[PDB]
């Protein structure tokens, strides 16, 4: 079980700092978080079918905080030398492809079993129902279940940062030009990640294989969100969609 090489530590230091600098965690979330009033997302008539409707008030609060979150994903990627050297067209495709995947991971690692909330951008704590009714539908359930599941992993900033890099460098996104180059970058991240894991010595058998399953869960959330986005455009007024929100998931 090899630990990271000297070159891998350099990479690790790079991605970790990149993540830390864009994860909005200077003044830790547990203390900074405000709980979205229970009133918001609350259905007035219990017996009216939920169907695929969207709570527009909840939706409004979410699109308000989502833009600065989207920008942090971009800044994260833009702090990686490998990414920066990719053609702009590929950069765009990779960002549109992993944006939700990374934001969902960042929210999932901030799951709180006490209140049963996910803390978004380390500032707004929301419940399963709020995020569900507010527009995500079952994707909210997926993110919360993932959050619950990660709680025992004890993932540090390096491991979260590495997961983000792996998702960022996905050569299977439709339309990519530098497929080979992107895959090579992912392999380098994957390898450095596996070695960091061995170095960490987590007390759990097959931790690496299990971590990889979480990446798969995030890929599913990402794609499922693309679908839920189309529904939002149909259920919500065009005015509640910020230009950045549209540009990234268009």
Ligand X SMILES: CC(C)c1cc(Oc2c(Br)cc(CCC(=O)O)cc2Br)ccc1O
Contacts to ligand X by CB under 6 A: 59, 62-63, 65-66, 69, 72, 100, 103-104, 106-107, 120-122, 134-136, 143, 225, 229
Residues 86-125: b if buried by 16+ CB within 10 A, e if exposed: beeebbebbbbbbbbbbbbbbbbbbbbeeeebbbbbbebb
By C-beta, is 166 or 197 nearer to ligand X? Answer: 166
Rounded to an integer, what distance in angstroms lies between the CA atom of residue 114 and that of residue 120? 16
Is residue 69 exposed (0-12), middle (13-18) or buried (19+ Cβ within 10 Å)?
buried
The residue number with the shortest CB distance to ligand X is 135
- Spatial distance between the Cα atoms of 74 and 91, rounded to a whole number of angstroms: 9
CB of 8 to ligand X, least distance (A): 26
The minimum distance between CB 138 and ligand X, in angstroms, equals 13
Q: Where are the alpha helices (DSSP H) in 78-156?
A: 81-84, 88-108, 128-131, 138-150
Residue nearer to ligand X on the CB measure, 120 or 163: 120
Of the two residues 59 and 193, which places its CB atom closer to ligand X in the complex? 59
Of 13 and 233, which has the nearer Cβ to ligand X? Answer: 233
At its nearest, how many Å lie between ligand X and the CB of residue 136?
5
Q: Decide whether 143 or 192 has the Cβ nearer to ligand X.
A: 143
Residue 33 and residue 119: Cα distance in Å, rounded? 7
In the three-class reduction of DSSP (H, G, I as helix; E, B as strand; rest coil), residue 124 is classed as: strand
Nearer to ligand X, 129 or 134 (CB): 134
Looking at the DSSP bridge assignments, the partners of residue 107 are: none
Distance CA 214, CA 233 (A): 29
CB of 116 to ligand X, least distance (A): 15
C-alpha dihedral sign at 9, 13, 15, 19: positive
Min CB(109)–ligand X separation in Å? 9
């Amino acid at each position: 079980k090899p630990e990271p090489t000297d070159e891998e530590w350099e990479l690790i230091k790079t991605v970790t700092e990149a993540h830390v600098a864009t994860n909005a965690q200077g003044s830790h979330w547990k203390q900074k978080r405000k709980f979205l009033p229970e009133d918001i997302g609350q259905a007035p008539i219990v017996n009216a079918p939920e169907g695929g409707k969207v709570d527009l008030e909840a939706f409004s609060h979410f699109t308000k905080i989502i833009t600065p979150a989207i920008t942090r994903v971009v800044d994260f990627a833009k702090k990686l030398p490998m990414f920066c050297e990719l053609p702009c067209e590929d950069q765009i495709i990779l960002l549109k492809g992993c944006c939700m995947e990374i934001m969902s991971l960042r929210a999932a690692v901030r799951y709180d079993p006490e209140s049963e909330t996910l803390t978004l951008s380390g500032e707004m704590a929301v419940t399963r129902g709020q995020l569900k009714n507010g527009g995500l539908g079952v994707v909210s359930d997926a993110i919360f279940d993932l959050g619950m599941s990660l709680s025992s992993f004890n993932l540090d900033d390096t491991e979260v940062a590495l997961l983000q890099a792996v998702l960022l460098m996905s050569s299977d996104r439709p339309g990519l030009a530098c497929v080979e180059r992107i895959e090579k970058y992912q392999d380098s991240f994957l390898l450095a990640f596996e070695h960091y894991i061995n170095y960490r010595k987590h007390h759990v058998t097959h931790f690496w294989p299990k971590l990889l399953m979480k990446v798969t869960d995030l890929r599913m959330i990402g794609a499922c969100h693309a679908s839920r986005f189309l529904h939002m455009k149909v259920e919500c007024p065009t005015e509640l969609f910020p230009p950045l929100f549209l540009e990234v998931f268009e």
